[PDB]
Design a protein around this motif. Structure first.
Motif, PDB file in Angstrom:
ATOM      1  N   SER A 206      -7.581   6.589  -1.585  1.00 44.50           N
ATOM      2  CA  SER A 206      -6.920   5.574  -0.769  1.00 44.50           C
ATOM      3  C   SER A 206      -7.796   4.336  -0.605  1.00 44.50           C
TER       4      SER A 206
ATOM      5  N   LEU B 214       0.822  -1.198   0.000  1.00 42.12           N
ATOM      6  CA  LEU B 214       0.000   0.000   0.000  1.00 42.12           C
ATOM      7  C   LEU B 214       0.863   1.259   0.000  1.00 42.12           C
TER       8      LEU B 214
ATOM      9  N   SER C  78      -2.281   5.641   2.931  1.00 39.46           N
ATOM     10  CA  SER C  78      -3.072   4.566   3.513  1.00 39.46           C
ATOM     11  C   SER C  78      -2.398   4.005   4.756  1.00 39.46           C
TER      12      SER C  78
ATOM     13  N   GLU D 235      -7.826   2.374  -3.615  1.00 38.74           N
ATOM     14  CA  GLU D 235      -6.551   1.666  -3.640  1.00 38.74           C
ATOM     15  C   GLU D 235      -6.596   0.413  -2.775  1.00 38.74           C
ATOM     16  N   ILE D 236      -7.258   0.485  -1.619  1.00 37.29           N
ATOM     17  CA  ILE D 236      -7.250  -0.661  -0.713  1.00 37.29           C
ATOM     18  C   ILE D 236      -8.150  -1.767  -1.249  1.00 37.29           C
TER      19      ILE D 236
END
Lengths: 73, 51
Positions: free
Chosen positions: A50, A13, A17, A53-54
């Motif tokens: 974020s 990550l 994050s 992204e996760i």
């Protein structure tokens, strides 16, 4: 599963994050995936990018949020 | 390093190549190394260290 007890270290990550999850203090994902979308959007100073992204890093390894577990960890 | 080229270069020549001081270049190298140290880019790599 060995991987949801694998730290967020190895999610690959970004460090933004990193700040978000350090605030949340979720080291492994075995409790991460039981948490929902708003439970992730309760983060301090965390938005769309974020969290997309996760979910990206989750669906890279075949997981997402909201899952259910038993006797964890 | 000298990876797949001729001579490896000092940090200053690298900053020359990118118009930066050598400290900028050290930052770049350290970040790339930290990135590579993690597995998922380093499992097979560290397996080259057979021990």
């Amino acid at each position: 599963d060995p991987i949801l007890l694998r730290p967020v270290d190895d999610l690959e990550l970004t460090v933004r994050s990193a700040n978000c999850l350090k605030a949340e203090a979720i080291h492994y994902i075995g409790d991460l995936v039981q948490r929902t979308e708003v439970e992730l959007l309760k983060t301090p100073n965390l938005g769309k990018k974020s969290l997309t992204e996760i979910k990206d890093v989750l669906a890279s390894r075949g997981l997402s949020l909201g899952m259910r577990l038993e006797n964890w960890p | 390093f000298g990876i797949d080229m001729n001579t490896d270069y000092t940090l200053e020549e690298v900053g020359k190549q990118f118009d930066v001081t050598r400290e900028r270049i050290r930052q770049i190298e350290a970040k790339a190394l930290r990135k590579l140290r993690h597995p998922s880019r380093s499992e097979v790599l560290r397996s080259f260290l057979d021990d």
